[PDB]
Amino acid sequence: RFYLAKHSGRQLTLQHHMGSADLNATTRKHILQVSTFQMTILMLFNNREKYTF
């Protein structure tokens, strides 16, 4: 929304094969790391565990 409101002219195509992230897990709170590949699978696990292929 910002890139289309202020810098109107470009198209922010979405992708997954680049970048990283810091997954804050939680006895202590150890923050993990996901390189834009395991974010979707871990999010689906957060929504509901006991999944498969």
């Binding site: 002219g9 470009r10 922010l12 992230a21 810091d22 804050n24 993990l32 696990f45 957060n46």
Partner: protein
Amino acid sequence: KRFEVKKWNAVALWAWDIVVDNCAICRNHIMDLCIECQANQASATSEECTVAWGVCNHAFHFHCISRWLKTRQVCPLDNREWEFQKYGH
């Protein structure tokens, strides 16, 4: 929840007026041949006719912009010197 995302670092690519539905020089499509090719075959004889990519993120058929470089120089949709930062889609 058990796992919560704190940081993210996506990299967002951007495109100028490449017009994926219409090359701005000949008006046919980003792909699908050009006005100087029409028929897929038309005696292809090796060579090529793909999508040329400029530094100003504009796209045309490699041929259309090579033929437009005989009429002008600075990329059509701006005033920056057209470069050839890529060949193909």
